[PDB]
């Protein structure tokens, strides 16, 4: 009632995009949008489609 | 009368009804028998990377057309043309860039149409010629703004870099060698064609 | 009365109400098994080529809309017709050129608009007449001016040339070649009929 | 004395950059200038670097 705690729900592969890089963006606009409310936690669905360990390559 | 263009853009299909500051290529035709063979030489390898080119274009515009669309910003120069219509005939010329008084500032810019106007005719021996134009891209991208506009039209020039990446293969790249050492023999033969006519 | 047309246009569809200088190809209709037979296959064959021709007409007029309103200076010949209007019934009439005696000139002239109004009728059995179309634009741009409009008029004639070999493909042109002994056989007894009629 | 051996000295991948063909155009300004100097010695420190695997 006071402080609306947010959410976010974010899944895994879409923040992964083609181009080049711009899958930093898709999470640059994602954190300067936690910071529109205070009380706001993020949601990272399936956060091995993101940051994966390294195989052999 | 004649367009008011700056960038040297021209070649065997059209573009050559044009004049600017700096070097242009404007060529269909500007002892004996070996310059009659070279002539022979000339026309039959000429087509045939002119095809090439056209090949190069076709398989061009399936990116070309996102990277058009996507943004308008950058197709169009900062600077108006009309600062720059006076000194054909503020702004000074250098060797190849423009300087300005105000704040003495380089721009190498262009309007984003030149590349698939410069394949219209087609001299892009080389994807290295891409390269160039990318590499330019990335030139505007450096010369003019704040780290916003910077930092995003690099971006969008390392997207080109990534398309020039896949355009750009081996044994293309091999193909593209041979007719870059035929072409750098023809705009030596050509410069000094129009040197002695 | 009758158009005072001096090209040889003429086909199934229609324009054969025209009077010319040279050989003009009038034909809608103008032993004896053999002699019907022949009117049989005639019909029949034509109506396909035909029909060809319109495919023609159809994958032509999509250069041609750019190439015909891209320039209006060439679609009017520089010596006006009226001219050529008195020697129907200054210039002398040679096997099929016009010569001037002020001057001594020899001109293949065309409007621009007799290939887009000859696929309306449609004899163009091969590229080839496409091919001859765009060399008598060549003709026209090399036997009436100077420098600037001969190169300018070149550089359209290569451009249609280079849409010419676009639509010149193998499996057309051996289909073409088809039908261009197809019309061969056809006009050879369509002159032996007007003879003989 | 009379003649240079004159001595020619590259770095480890410094002729190959991230772009593509500085690289070669080096090469070329390179090979060209030991083709004028007749007699010349041309070094790749570190090469590597230069042709990795």
């Given at each position: 009632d006071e402080?609306?705690?947010?959410f976010?729900?974010?899944k895994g592969?879409?923040?992964?995009?083609?181009?080049?890089?711009?899958a930093?963006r898709?999470?640059?606009?994602?954190?300067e949008?936690?910071?529109?409310?205070?009380?706001?936690?993020?949601f990272?669905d399936?956060?091995?489609?993101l940051?994966?360990?390294?195989?052999?390559? | 009368?004649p367009?008011?263009?700056?960038?040297?853009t021209?070649?065997?299909?059209?573009?050559?009804?044009?004049?600017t500051?700096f070097?242009?290529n404007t060529?269909?035709?500007?002892p004996?028998?070996?310059?009659?063979?070279?002539?022979?030489?000339?026309?039959?390898?000429?087509?045939?990377?002119?095809?090439?080119?056209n090949?190069?274009?076709?398989?061009?515009?399936?990116l070309?057309?996102?990277?058009?669309?996507?943004?308008?910003?950058?197709?169009?120069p900062?600077?108006?043309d009309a600062?720059?219509?006076?000194?054909?005939?503020?702004y000074?010329?250098?060797?190849?860039?423009?300087?300005?008084?105000?704040?003495?500032?380089?721009?190498?810019?262009?309007?984003?149409?030149?590349?698939?106007?410069?394949?219209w005719?087609?001299?892009?021996?080389?994807?290295?010629?891409?390269?160039?134009?990318?590499?330019?891209?990335?030139?505007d991208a450096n010369?003019?703004?704040?780290?916003?506009?910077?930092?995003?039209?690099?971006?969008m020039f390392?997207n080109?870099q990534?398309g020039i990446?896949?355009?750009?293969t081996?044994d293309?790249?091999?193909?593209?060698?041979?007719?870059?050492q035929?072409?750098?023999?023809?705009?030596?033969?050509?410069?000094?064609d129009?040197?002695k006519?």
């Open positions: 402080r609306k705690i947010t976010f729900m974010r592969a879409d923040i992964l995009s083609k181009w080049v890089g711009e930093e898709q999470l640059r606009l994602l954190f949008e936690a910071k529109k409310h205070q009380p706001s936690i993020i990272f399936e956060i091995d489609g940051a994966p360990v390294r195989s052999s390559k | 009368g367009t008011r263009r700056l960038f040297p021209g070649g065997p299909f059209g573009g050559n009804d044009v004049t500051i070097g242009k060529n269909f035709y500007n004996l028998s070996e310059k009659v063979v070279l002539r022979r030489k000339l026309k039959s390898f000429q087509h045939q990377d002119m095809r090439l080119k090949v190069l274009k076709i398989k061009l515009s399936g070309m057309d996102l990277f058009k669309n996507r943004y308008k910003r950058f197709r169009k900062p600077i108006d600062f720059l219509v006076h000194l054909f005939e503020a000074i010329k250098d060797e190849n860039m423009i300087l300005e008084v105000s704040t003495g500032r380089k721009f190498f810019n262009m309007d984003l149409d030149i590349v698939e106007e410069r394949l005719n087609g001299y892009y021996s080389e994807p290295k010629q891409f390269l160039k134009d990318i590499e330019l891209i990335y030139r010369t003019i703004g704040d780290r916003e506009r910077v930092i995003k039209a690099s971006e390392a080109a990534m990446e896949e355009i750009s081996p293309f790249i091999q193909e593209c060698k041979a007719t870059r035929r072409d750098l023999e023809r705009q030596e033969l050509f410069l000094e129009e040197e006519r």
